[model samples]
Target: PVLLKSTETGQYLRINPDGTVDGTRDRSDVHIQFQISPEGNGEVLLKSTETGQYLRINPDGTVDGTRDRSDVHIQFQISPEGNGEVLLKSTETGQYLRINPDGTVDGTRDRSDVHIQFQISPEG
Candidate 1:
């Protein structure tokens, strides 16, 4: 398990009890697990260690940690930013996973925004 910390906000990606995926200023939130997709080469799946739900991106660009592990929205392509950060791009929508100003997670940008980069850390 690992924590996906936002490079821009210094927040950690969290899975809420309500099954929503968002960013939290707290560092104690649950960590996320990465699963290599069975169907795609170099594709990955992010799953919550708390709820056992997969992080999914909606068609409307909203984000959630819900059921359906086979959904395409669960697939992401990790791209390195040439620094210590990385970008999670949705393979299904071709959009980047972003942390909004309000600390919500979404897939809304085609281009790399500052909030799109994240730091992966081991869960402690």
Candidate 2:
């Protein structure tokens, strides 16, 4: 498991038990552990260790966690942003994953948005 941190907010991405995706400041729970698996073609699959579900992106630009591994929309095009940071772009919808100041995780159409920058930190 690894920690996906927001470069803008310094919060970590968490997938709650109810399949909701959010940015969190907490470091004491399973909600923040995500297993990043490579899906090839410079894409990856983010699965929440707590819920054993993949991070999913909706066609309407919403974000969520899902147990359906067969869904093709779960893959995110991993784009490196340098400085050990990266941008997660949706392969299907062409949206980028962004974290808001309120700790909300969602999708944005802007690829150049700073909120979409993330630090993929490894765990101990």
Candidate 3:
């Protein structure tokens, strides 16, 4: 398992049982169990081990979890910037998964350096 903590806000990508994905300033094992599964062809599926659902971008651009595996919002490209930061890009809308100013997880077409860096760390 892995914990995806946002670089900008020092928050973790949190998943809940209700299928809600949020950015949390506090880090906890219960909130950061993400399944970094490969989708083949360089794509990845960020699933939640806690919720048993896949991370997906909602129609309104919010990040959430869903049971649908065929949803394009669940597909992402792991883009490395070479500056020690990784970008999670949505295949459906070409937007990056970023933590907004309000600490909400959402899809963004504009990646302003720090806003897109999600530090992936091992969860023991």
Winning model by lDDT: 2
Residue-by-residue lDDT tens digits, candidate 1, 1-124: 6878888888788877688787888765444443334445677787777677777887889888877755777888888886888888878887888887798788867674788888887765
Could you arrange the candidates by lDDT from highest to lowest? Answer: 2, 3, 1
Ranking by TM-score: 2, 3, 1
lDDT of 2 at 96: 90
When 2 and 3 are scored with lDDT, the better candidate is: 2
Runs in model 3 lying further than 4 Å from the true structure = none
TM-score, candidate number 2: 0.94
lDDT per residue as tens, model 3, 3-61? 88787788888878888877877765586788888897778999887778898976677
Shift of residue 5 alpha carbon in model 1, Å: 0.8
Which regions in candidate 2 have their CA more than 4 angstroms from the true location?
40-42
TM-score of each: 0.87, 0.94, 0.90
**Residue lDDT tens for model 2, 3-62:** 999988989998888888888888887789888888866778998877798999899878
Q: Residue 52 deviation, candidate 1, in Å?
A: 0.5
Clashing pairs in 1: none
Clashes of each: 0, 0, 0
Question: Which wins on lDDT, candidate 1 or candidate 3?
Answer: 3
In order, what is each prediction's RMSD in angstroms?
Answer: 2.1, 1.2, 1.5
